[PDB]
Amino acid sequence: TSIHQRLDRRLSGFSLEQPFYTSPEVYALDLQHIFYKQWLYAVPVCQLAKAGSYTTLRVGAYEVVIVRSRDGEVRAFHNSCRHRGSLICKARQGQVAKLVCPYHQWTYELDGKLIWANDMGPDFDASKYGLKPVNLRNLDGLIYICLSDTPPDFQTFAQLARPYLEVHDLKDAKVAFTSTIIEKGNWKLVWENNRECYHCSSNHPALCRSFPLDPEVAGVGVSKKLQAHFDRCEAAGTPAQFVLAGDGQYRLARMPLQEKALSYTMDGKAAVSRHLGRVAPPDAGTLLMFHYPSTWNHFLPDHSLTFRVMPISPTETEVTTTWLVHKDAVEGVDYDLKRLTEVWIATNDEDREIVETNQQGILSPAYVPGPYSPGQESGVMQFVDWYAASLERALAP
Amino acid sequence: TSIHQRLDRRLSGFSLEQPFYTSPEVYALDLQHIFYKQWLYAVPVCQLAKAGSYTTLRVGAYEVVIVRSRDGEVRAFHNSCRHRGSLICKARQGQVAKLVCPYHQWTYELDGKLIWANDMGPDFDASKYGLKPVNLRNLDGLIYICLSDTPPDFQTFAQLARPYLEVHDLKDAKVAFTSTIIEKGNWKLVWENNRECYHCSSNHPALCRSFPLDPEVAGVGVSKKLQAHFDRCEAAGTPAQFVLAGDGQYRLARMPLQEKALSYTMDGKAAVSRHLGRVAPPDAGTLLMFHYPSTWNHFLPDHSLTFRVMPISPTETEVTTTWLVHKDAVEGVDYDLKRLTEVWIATNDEDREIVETNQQGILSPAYVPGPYSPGQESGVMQFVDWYAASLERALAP
Amino acid sequence: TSIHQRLDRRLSGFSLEQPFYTSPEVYALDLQHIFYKQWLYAVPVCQLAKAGSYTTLRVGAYEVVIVRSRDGEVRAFHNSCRHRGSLICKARQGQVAKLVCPYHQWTYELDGKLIWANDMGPDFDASKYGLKPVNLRNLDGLIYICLSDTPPDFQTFAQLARPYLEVHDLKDAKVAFTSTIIEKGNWKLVWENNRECYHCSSNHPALCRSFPLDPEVAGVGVSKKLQAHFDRCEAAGTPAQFVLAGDGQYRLARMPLQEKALSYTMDGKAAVSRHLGRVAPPDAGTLLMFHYPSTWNHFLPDHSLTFRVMPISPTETEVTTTWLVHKDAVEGVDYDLKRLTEVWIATNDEDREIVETNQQGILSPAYVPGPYSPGQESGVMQFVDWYAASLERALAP
């Protein structure tokens, strides 16, 4: 049975046939046609504070390095020396004056240009051997990248998102904490787990203290209560109302939290007393933003969290959660690290366990697609449709 | 060279060509056509003492859960939720009132029926989404399962075995100890090592204290001495005589132990003073039972041992040894754990080492089939014939 | 794209296209057509001091055992029992009277002949089941082996090398220390790193104390200074001048060390005060010898080092460094272990890091061949040409 036959018979209301989650062949397609073609969230721009600042990340097999150039611009490059291929930047992050390959010291300017290569002979044209660039966008303090030489349109999304994101002043953030975990499940299982709160009341004690179980929230017809919340927000100049991509790729919405909760904390109060951004009112709740296939996000009035999904192998996915707070917020004074992070560290561990347990069942040959819940899992259906549709376009001659 | 060509030129008196032991392609065939089609030993029924008792096990990629239902029946099921596939029972064993998937709490009755699924909408037919059953037989206190929807005939074997097994009262046993090890050799190498005692006098000091080296014993024309033993047994009402399957799949025989030995112990005396079953005479020796591809077994007058062979990968096999004793036998009083187990724990470690060393040599491209010993390894020849024959039937259009 | 197309478009002055370094398909070809067909360095003969001495090693999947026979001859054999395939010698090295398989004790004489096999029946012809021999050459105290039944010509190389090697009296050495490491890079990346000192001044602080950075040295038109050194050597009866194989497979040359340095030590003085061999003058420098695909070597006046390259997987290579000193040299008296070894232990660690970092960049799909330095990396070009040419001959119908 071919991939085309599997996609042809796929019905929208059901989880995917086994190979989509477990086969190396579908993983190769997901990499080639999804992760290698769409725009991807990489890191907050505040990680590249000073010029010479760099951060590295792997995308599938690609080795990418992101650096802040001399001119103040942020640029991305393939982290592979044009000489014999070596990684140039081995550390996760750092600062340098120049990009100097540790092998033979071919030296690049922070804009990728090869400015010195020892003893290469008279016929060497350095202009042909600068670092290969990687398409990059700055989404209001959040760095996105695209590995395709023919990137899809980012602008529609950026323009739609700017109003919602700019009120968080992400450019003025610092990273208060980063958590990187590996979940032993296909990247799609990670997203499907993320696009429903069908599993929340049983699996997320801490999260449920502040994050609503309403399917309307964590999922994908605006109710009265919700529109009322949108209104308080927007009356205060804080964009809030539902926005969904034409093609399902992204969604933004500022949702209310559980009664009285202001933030993702055990007591429900703000985690940080010096807010990141100018969100109003204090109880504006959480701006949810997703953008397939790479990222979901929770921007709160006091602090923000980005999540980055990166594929490791058919049955492994790296999830990186970044807590953003105001750059002048002081740990121990303006916030407490444990108190800031504990809820989502626990929620993440609980999701990992769940995803991995899901994956283990799926690996049984007895596993067959099952029906998603119309009322609790329409967001899951929504993601799978976007996924299949994307896969089909890419596979079309 | 195809599998059909390899099987076509195979001569019975020789070990198999390399790929049978080391290739992923033969492993896939062994799983599909052997482990997924034949009956397999799973666990003693005494592990499912109370209703709501369950135990889980993996067979190849299949995730199986075995549970004792409300009606006192023992049933097996695919351990994959009909919603989105998750394992329902994560622990190795436990008790529950209901099968409740930890993901979204789809809840099943202990007979597999879906009795509650949250918010699935009016068009949801729970009768279509009960757990998938797994064929199950109870062989006189030993649970066997078959992953095929068209199971082979178990009854011929069961009827032949009942007389030999029933005198052990396995229904009244408890598990005194379980040992699970992984041997780094193809599952067939584990069986070939098991079907001869050609290697015993050099590799098994402890075992050799009580278990005879006679090829007639551990192997596959009844001598005088042996028939005499069969006779003492059967004169005492204890079935003993050789039984071999028409097609070689199974064999039963109650063999004498080394002079004076009554059990698998360092001193040769009984391990347990409260016997499991009603075997007579005291020196009835050991009932050997094998059933390809899953199990060999030693039932003694005082206690019994089952062994379960499960494939992990082309070059890994899980062997699970279960010591059964009478349910009222008291550890520290009626038997001593170390004394009960030490012989076969050591024998198992020694076999693991041997199998792994065998496998390592076999992985050399220089390895070619070699001649089995007619007198010491006819049981090995017997197993390989059953194996090849099984493979050929399954491959026949 | 086929291997033939990749080889067809390959230009000599560039590093290889990705799959040569990372694909399982090229790894299978390298094993089949290179490592399994060419002569390979195994161990110094002094490791087989006494009769019954043996040493074992893996070559790709092949399991080889090398033993010193009763007649004083050194022979090699496939380390797989002719019965059911088991390794016969499990230890890395040892002594035995006979080769006795630990499984069923089939017993071989040290020349491979099967002299005893228990109970194999009247139709058993032991003459058909002796250990399979492995072609073996003794290169003046260095044991080489060839896994092909139709070995290439070793004699041209041996005759060319004898004059250079014999003055080191390798037959009179002992192993003072062995270091085995795994580098996470393709075996070709290990060689390319070895065939240039383009990376030396930045990566090898210790080595650079005594080993010259002149490309003429570590690389592949004899300058005045160098010929002068050749002359001092050969005037003293010590062969020194450049020898390169017709087909690029091997090279020998006795190069001068850094000003005043006599050996690979932190202080530059001799490591051992009792010299191995009769090299003269004291500052004769280092005899470099390479032989693709298995070995590079540094023979100094006081002691010698062999390096053995063996493939582990597409992206892993085992490098084994052996320090040879005179058999009567006494540790703690005639040399200090740390002082003898520290330079090349560090150099090796530094190379491992470099190779692994090279490999990591290469695994990016963005990696493309790049230009080798004509003046610093002609030795690299030389190795890659030998490699491609070898691969092409072997692939020719």
Ligand code: PRO
């Ligand atoms: O339970 C969680 O953690 C995520 C939040 C959005 C939907 N599910």
Ligand code: PRO
């Ligand atoms: O040696 C052993 O442990 C097994 C027992 C039956 C044949 N070989």
Ligand code: PRO
């Ligand atoms: O740097 C090193 O260690 C090796 C020596 C020969 C060429 N490169």
Ligand code: FES
């Ligand atoms: S690989 Fe970067 S300088 Fe050689």
Ligand code: FES
């Ligand atoms: S997977 Fe079992 S309830 Fe959703």
Ligand code: FES
């Ligand atoms: S495998 Fe060597 S004696 Fe049986």
Ligand SMILES: [Fe+3]
């Ligand atoms: Fe969750």
Ligand SMILES: [Fe+3]
């Ligand atoms: Fe055994």
Ligand SMILES: [Fe+3]
């Ligand atoms: Fe080096």
